[PDB]
Each structure stands twice: as structure tokens, then as C-alpha cells.
Motif scaffolding. Sequence first.
Motif, PDB file in Angstrom:
ATOM      1  N   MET A  63      -0.198   3.185   0.932  1.00  0.00           N
ATOM      2  CA  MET A  63       0.441   4.346   0.289  1.00  0.00           C
ATOM      3  C   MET A  63       2.002   3.606   0.358  1.00  0.00           C
ATOM      4  SD  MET A  63       1.426   7.260  -0.910  1.00  0.00           S
ATOM      5  CE  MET A  63       0.753   8.086  -2.398  1.00  0.00           C
ATOM      6  N   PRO A  64       2.450   3.859   1.761  1.00  0.00           N
ATOM      7  CA  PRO A  64       4.142   3.505   1.718  1.00  0.00           C
ATOM      8  C   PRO A  64       4.237   1.852   2.114  1.00  0.00           C
ATOM      9  CG  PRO A  64       3.516   5.463   2.989  1.00  0.00           C
ATOM     10  CD  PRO A  64       2.030   4.418   2.313  1.00  0.00           C
ATOM     11  N   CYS A  65       5.202   1.107   3.245  1.00  0.00           N
ATOM     12  CA  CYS A  65       5.135   0.687   3.753  1.00  0.00           C
ATOM     13  C   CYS A  65       5.107   0.924   5.041  1.00  0.00           C
ATOM     14  CB  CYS A  65       6.002  -0.879   2.880  1.00  0.00           C
ATOM     15  SG  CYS A  65       7.087  -1.935   4.638  1.00  0.00           S
ATOM     16  N   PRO A  73       3.445  -1.581  -6.213  1.00  0.00           N
ATOM     17  CA  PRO A  73       2.606  -1.928  -6.441  1.00  0.00           C
ATOM     18  C   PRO A  73       1.417  -2.727  -5.220  1.00  0.00           C
ATOM     19  CG  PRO A  73       4.096  -2.135  -8.349  1.00  0.00           C
ATOM     20  CD  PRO A  73       5.243  -1.834  -7.056  1.00  0.00           C
ATOM     21  N   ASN A  74       0.439  -2.750  -5.060  1.00  0.00           N
ATOM     22  CA  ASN A  74      -0.791  -3.344  -4.389  1.00  0.00           C
ATOM     23  C   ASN A  74      -0.164  -4.462  -4.621  1.00  0.00           C
ATOM     24  OD1 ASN A  74      -3.425  -0.680  -4.988  1.00  0.00           O
ATOM     25  ND2 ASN A  74      -2.311  -1.188  -3.469  1.00  0.00           N
ATOM     26  N   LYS A  85      -0.903  -4.400   6.135  1.00  0.00           N
ATOM     27  CA  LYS A  85       0.189  -4.552   4.717  1.00  0.00           C
ATOM     28  C   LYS A  85       0.948  -4.151   4.948  1.00  0.00           C
ATOM     29  N   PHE A  86       2.079  -5.242   4.539  1.00  0.00           N
ATOM     30  CA  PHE A  86       3.688  -4.803   4.304  1.00  0.00           C
ATOM     31  C   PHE A  86       4.216  -5.442   2.823  1.00  0.00           C
ATOM     32  CE2 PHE A  86       3.432  -4.493   8.956  1.00  0.00           C
ATOM     33  CZ  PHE A  86       2.953  -3.715   8.685  1.00  0.00           C
ATOM     34  N   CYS A  87       5.699  -5.612   2.780  1.00  0.00           N
ATOM     35  CA  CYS A  87       5.743  -5.746   1.330  1.00  0.00           C
ATOM     36  C   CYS A  87       6.222  -7.362   1.262  1.00  0.00           C
ATOM     37  CB  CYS A  87       7.713  -5.736   1.304  1.00  0.00           C
ATOM     38  SG  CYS A  87       7.921  -3.782   1.398  1.00  0.00           S
ATOM     39  N   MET A  88       6.151  -7.906   0.607  1.00  0.00           N
ATOM     40  CA  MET A  88       6.301  -9.791   0.127  1.00  0.00           C
ATOM     41  C   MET A  88       7.784  -9.721   1.294  1.00  0.00           C
ATOM     42  SD  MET A  88       3.697  -9.753  -0.876  1.00  0.00           S
ATOM     43  CE  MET A  88       3.031 -11.839  -0.423  1.00  0.00           C
ATOM     44  N   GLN A  89       8.650  -8.996   0.628  1.00  0.00           N
ATOM     45  CA  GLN A  89      10.383  -9.609   1.758  1.00  0.00           C
ATOM     46  C   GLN A  89       9.740  -9.235   2.991  1.00  0.00           C
ATOM     47  OE1 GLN A  89      13.313 -10.533   0.289  1.00  0.00           O
ATOM     48  NE2 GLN A  89      13.249 -10.914   2.342  1.00  0.00           N
ATOM     49  N   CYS A  90       9.719  -7.580   3.761  1.00  0.00           N
ATOM     50  CA  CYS A  90       9.803  -7.221   4.595  1.00  0.00           C
ATOM     51  C   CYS A  90       8.887  -8.577   5.634  1.00  0.00           C
ATOM     52  CB  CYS A  90       8.925  -5.996   4.525  1.00  0.00           C
ATOM     53  SG  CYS A  90      10.228  -4.137   4.098  1.00  0.00           S
ATOM     54  N   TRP A  91       8.293  -9.031   5.174  1.00  0.00           N
ATOM     55  CA  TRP A  91       7.265 -10.475   5.044  1.00  0.00           C
ATOM     56  C   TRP A  91       7.903 -11.000   5.870  1.00  0.00           C
ATOM     57  CZ3 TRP A  91       3.307 -10.832   8.029  1.00  0.00           C
ATOM     58  CH2 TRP A  91       1.609 -10.509   8.581  1.00  0.00           C
TER      59      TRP A  91
END
Length: 414
Positions: A63-65, A73-74, A85-91
Motif C-alpha cells: 500500500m505504501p512504499c 499505482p501498482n 515491492k518498492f518504487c521504480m525510482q527507489c529501486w
Amino acid sequence: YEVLTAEQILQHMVECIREVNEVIQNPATITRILLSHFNWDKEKLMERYFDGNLEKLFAECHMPCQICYLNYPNSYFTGLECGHKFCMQCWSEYLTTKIMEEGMGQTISCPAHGCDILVDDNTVMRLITDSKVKLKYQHLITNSFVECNRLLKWCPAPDCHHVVKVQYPDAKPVRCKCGRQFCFNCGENWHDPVKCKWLKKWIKKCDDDSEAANTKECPKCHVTIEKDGGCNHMVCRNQNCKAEFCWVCLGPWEPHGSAWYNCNRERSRAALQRYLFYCNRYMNHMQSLRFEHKLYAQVKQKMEEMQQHNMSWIEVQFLKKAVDVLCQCRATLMYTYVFAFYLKKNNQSIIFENNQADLENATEVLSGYLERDISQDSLQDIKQKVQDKYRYCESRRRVLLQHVHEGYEKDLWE
Ligand SMILES: [Zn+2]
Ligand SMILES: [Zn+2]
Ligand SMILES: [Zn+2]
Ligand SMILES: [Zn+2]
Ligand SMILES: [Zn+2]
Ligand SMILES: [Zn+2]
């Protein structure tokens, strides 16, 4: 010589990693860690799995990062098998900062990191936004493959991820389309006269010093001069003096080329003195070589501008060769100072002393031309001058090295 890219190696590696995944069935990420532990000898690995327990074999290779707290969005959350599962950016951020520094292993585990199950390779590839780092990882993980394999050597350039593949490791020149050239065996820029043992003796000694001449003052009018170029024939511009001298030694021109002038050449400190001499030519030639690499850029314009007016592509292409030879002779030169430094005073030292002093002035005659004196000349006149200049330049080098190749045949010096 064959020139391969970084992707071509990773891709080749993947065909190797995957084809051996029967029966291992462990994904490509694991197999290479295994294939590294057994060091890319293939059969030596497959064995160690069969005859004994694999558990030990893995242990030898071991639900959150949730990062920036926010809801997305998922589609913006990519997970690992661990179920995080985290942000594409946090990744991309956890990825990039982890891969850059510090010096790491071949892995990159889970971002929560107590979840450590390593992120598989391809999933690290999709996830890193900046293309520059994607090449670093590609290099990073691949390093074992080419290191553990003979005939495959990295291009010895900081920015170059290409790799040269050879039939046999013969220590000869190779060109990477980099366009850098280097000694195959030791992986240093091509040194024709010297030996890898002697040339590597310097990288320790050149690095030994804890302390490259950008500017200097005229011998005649005493006015300051910055080094731009290129050849070392120096005409200082002040209406006072027309000198006209040499850059490395501040003495005049042109007793240079004359035989009466050598530009080439308590006891505790006597060594660091003759080093400062011999290294200063090595360092000043490198700088004078650097500003020659600019000429390739201008030569494309020189030919595109010349050709539209008068002549044909085959006819103009000699103008690149001049720079090729010039960049060839400039490299050959600074390395003869590795050669000359160690070899001492012997009757074979003074013979090669002359070929170098003949080659030194050969370069300055060409390098001084393509620098300044060229643009004034007529098209019919220039082609003849460029020709006869780099004809001698090229001849000298072969005559210089003619000696040097037979000088090491039966020991003459050290
Ligand atoms: Zn985030
Ligand atoms: Zn996890
Ligand atoms: Zn390269
Ligand atoms: Zn070498
Ligand atoms: Zn002056
Ligand atoms: Zn000089």
C-alpha cells in the motif's frame, strides 16, 4: 583481432550460463556465481555437484512504499520473490548507489536486506535508469568470464567497455575501435621499444613520486608562454623576440636537427636528478601527444572542405594518415624513454641515441606543420609537403625499431 562490445559479452555469457542450467535449473544469476567459484572451467563445476552434496558447494559460493513512504499505482511497484515491492525510482536509487560504491561483490541483495535473496541480473538491468551505470554492472558481473578466459581482454580504457578477442595471446598491437591501441599481454598503451617488465617498473616508480608542465617563460624576451600544441618548436609572440626555441630544453632552434646538439641527453640524490630528466620527456611527450588527438576532429573538416572544391576521397585520405603516423610516432617516442632510462651508457646506448634524436625532430617537423604552417600553403603544395614529411616520419620509426628489435636478440644492456 576481433572487436566485441560489452553487451555481446553479457549476451554470449548468457548463452553459456543458460546452456549449463541443465540440470542446475538455478536461474542465470546463480549459475555464474557458481561458474565463478569453479572459475569458468566448466566440467570442474558439474563434477562437484554430482559426487557429493550440493549444500557444501553452495556454501563455498554462498500500500505504501518502504523506502520513500508513499502510495503509488501498482504498476510503479516491482517486487522480488521475497515479496517486497518498492518504487521504480527507489529501486533505481538503491541500485545505482549500491553498484557505484563501495567496491562490492557480484550480488546486490534485497533492498530491505534482511530479506537478502539476491536480485537476479536481468531484473537489475531493466531497473537502472541511467545507461552509464548499466554498463558498469554489465562489466562488473562479466569480469570473471573474461578474466578467467584467455584470449579475451578488456580494453584498457576507463570509458571503454569493449573487449578484444584473439586467436592466441602473442603480445602484439590491437585496435579497439576505441580508437585506443595497446599491448595485448600487459594491457598498456602500445609500447613498441620497451618490455612489459621494464614498462611496469615505471608505473610503480611514476606512482612512487608524491608531487605536466602547463606554462613556461621565454629564454629570449623572458615573456610567459602557455603550451598549446602539439609540436615543441616554439615561436613566442612578442614584437621583441622572434625566438624560435625548443620547449623541453629551453635552448634555440634550429641547432635542433644539427649533430652538435643533443636534446636527448652525495650520490644518493644523484638518482632522482636523472629521473626528473628522463621522466620530464615522458610527461611532456604525453601532453604534446594529447593535443594531437584534437587534429582528428579538424582533419574531418579539412578533408570535407578540401574535397568539395577539387579532389577525390581516395586522394584526400593521406591527410588522416599523417595524423595516424604522427600519433603513432608520438607514442613510440615517450616509451623509448622507458627504454633509455634503464639501459645505461653502453656502446649500444649511443647508437639508439641517434635514431631517437632523428625521430624526435621527425615528429616536430610534421607536428609543427599540421599545427600552424599548413593552412597558409596551397593545395597542390601541401599534399607534397605532408607526404615527404610523414614518409620520413614513418621510415624513421621502422629504422629506429629495426635496431631495438635486434638489440634484445643478444643481450646488449640493462
Ligand atoms: Zn519509494
Ligand atoms: Zn525482500
Ligand atoms: Zn576501448
Ligand atoms: Zn606490454
Ligand atoms: Zn620571447
Ligand atoms: Zn630541445
